[PDB]
Amino acid sequence: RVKNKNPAPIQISAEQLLREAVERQDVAFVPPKINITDLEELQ
């Protein structure tokens, strides 16, 4: 009936906001490492 004015059992908290905002980050970008197969690219 989408009219559930009943106060939520879990109220939104500020620390929750900052935590779930930070959660948007992931691991450091992983690039496929370059393979030095010969001497010139090593140089």
């Binding site: 490492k33 393979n35 030095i36 197969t37 010969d38 001497l39 090593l42």
Partner: peptide, 24 residues
């Protein structure tokens, strides 16, 4: 010479390590 060579060999085995660790 040896440090360069060891770098080279590591590089081909890691280039082929993609096939080695393709499915794991």
């Amino acid at each position: 010479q040896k440090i360069i060579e060891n770098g080279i060999r590591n590089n081909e085995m890691e280039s082929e390590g993609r096939k080695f660790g393709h499915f794991e």
